[PDB]
Design a protein around this ligand. Structure first.
Ligand SMILES: O=c1ccn([C@@H]2O[C@H](COP(=O)(O)OP(=O)(O)OP(=O)(O)O)[C@@H](O)[C@H]2O)c(=O)[nH]1
Ligand SMILES: [Mg+2]
Ligand SMILES: [Mg+2]
Ligand SMILES: [Zn+2]
Length: 382
């Protein structure tokens, strides 16, 4: 992919590929509440790194114009305000307020750099992507089952991770305090680089952790013991030994040297830690530290937070921020996600269903299934 064709590719994309219809269907929420789409903040990042927010629109047409006209590199979605963002200059200090917004989560592979061995920073590969699978599975389960949120849109961020948009009517009205509280409930891995052991479990395990461990259990062997090989050598297993009491280090160090692979060594860790319990949950704290999701509290705390819009274009990778099918989450592949050059290539190889002919279609379907279930809820149908 070439980032210089981008300003040219965007023009075509924003005119004949971006699904404005389903897009407006989303943000207007069946017209039930007036000025809802009209008070929504957007932000655009043009060429030269020009950044502008407080963008508002009257309707889907007004949106289509201003975007094709601006032709932005980045499109961020903000809150629904007390007034029109466009006229914020006209609003008195104290009356311009962010009032409603979807509950949002940002999950970055980069935050796993201390527990993955294949990549670092903004690099991802198939060996470490499993972390996102476990993140989605773990968190979506909590949002669905523990919190009863019914309309959840998971989106690939374009490069390093996934976003989740929780759009239930009752959810969009949550105070910043409750939003912050949801993050605390979902969060287990605490500490910065200064902190070696980032997970501590009580004698009594809250169901959320239990169910979270059990999802991780399902992936741990292939991800951690095979792909990551977290016990390959001494340089690596010392990191694991740092997470368990010193009184078992020597016994384990020897067992690790006499074993051949991580599967053997992990099983040794399991037996030794277990004995240690008898006279607390070392095995699980290690799995949680290596596989449990890391969440940026700041993204989800603030109601006025601007998050990268679905179907945006990643300026460097060229990938489309595409919706993720929750039923096919283990099958999701960030490396086969259509790039803008690819869906423009396909459109140049053939008026409202032009996108259905491109590789972008199945993802728009998912967004539609997301939209359909919203309508039914507003109506009453299950
Ligand atoms: O000043 C701001 C305000 C808000 N944001 C918003 O915070 C979100 C945090 O997200 P990230 O900055 O971690 O990047 P990303 O998820 O959009 O995509 P990746 O490259 O990581 O895969 C971003 O998506 C952006 O919308 C900022 O980045 N800067
Ligand atoms: Mg991100
Ligand atoms: Mg972040
Ligand atoms: Zn990797």
């Amino acid at each position: 992919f070439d980032p210089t064709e981008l300003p040219e590719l965007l023009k075509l994309y924003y005119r004949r590929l971006f699904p404005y219809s389903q897009y407006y269907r989303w943000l207007n929420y069946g017209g039930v509440i007036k000025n809802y789409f009209q008070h929504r903040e957007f932000s655009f990042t043009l060429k030269d790194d020009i950044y502008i927010r407080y963008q508002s629109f009257n309707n889907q047409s007004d949106l289509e114009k201003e975007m094709q006209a601006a032709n932005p590199y980045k499109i961020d979605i903000g809150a629904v305000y007390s007034h029109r963002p466009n006229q914020h200059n006209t609003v008195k200090l104290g009356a311009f307020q962010a009032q409603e917004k979807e509950l949002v989560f940002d999950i970055d592979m980069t935050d796993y750099d201390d527990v993955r061995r294949c990549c670092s920073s903004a690099d991802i590969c198939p060996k470490c992507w499993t972390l996102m699978t476990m993140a989605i599975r773990i968190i979506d389960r909590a949002l669905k089952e523990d919190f009863g949120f019914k309309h959840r849109l998971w989106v690939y961020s374009g490069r390093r991770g996934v976003h989740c948009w929780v759009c239930d009517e009752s959810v969009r009205k949550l105070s910043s305090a409750v939003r912050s509280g949801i993050v605390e409930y979902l969060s287990l891995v605490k500490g910065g680089q200064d902190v070696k052991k980032k997970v501590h479990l009580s004698e009594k395990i809250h169901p959320f952790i239990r169910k979270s461990i059990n999802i991780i259990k399902k992936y741990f062997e292939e991800y951690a013991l095979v792909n990551q090989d977290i016990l390959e050598n001494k340089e690596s297993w010392d990191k694991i030994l740092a997470l368990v009491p010193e009184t078992i280090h020597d016994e384990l160090q020897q067992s690790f040297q006499k074993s051949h692979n991580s599967l053997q060594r992990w099983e040794h860790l399991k037996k030794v830690a277990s004995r240690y319990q008898n006279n607390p949950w070392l095995e699980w704290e290690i799995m949680l530290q290596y596989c449990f999701p890391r969440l940026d509290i700041n993204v989800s705390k603030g109601i006025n937070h601007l998050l990268k819009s679905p179907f945006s274009v990643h300026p460097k990778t060229g990938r489309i921020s595409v919706p993720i099918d929750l039923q096919k989450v283990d099958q999701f592949d960030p490396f086969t996600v259509p790039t803008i050059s690819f869906i423009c290539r396909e459109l140049d190889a053939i008026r409202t269903r032009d996108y259905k002919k491109t590789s972008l279609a199945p993802y728009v379907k998912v967004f539609e299934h997301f939209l359909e279930n919203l309508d039914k809820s507003r109506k009453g149908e299950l």
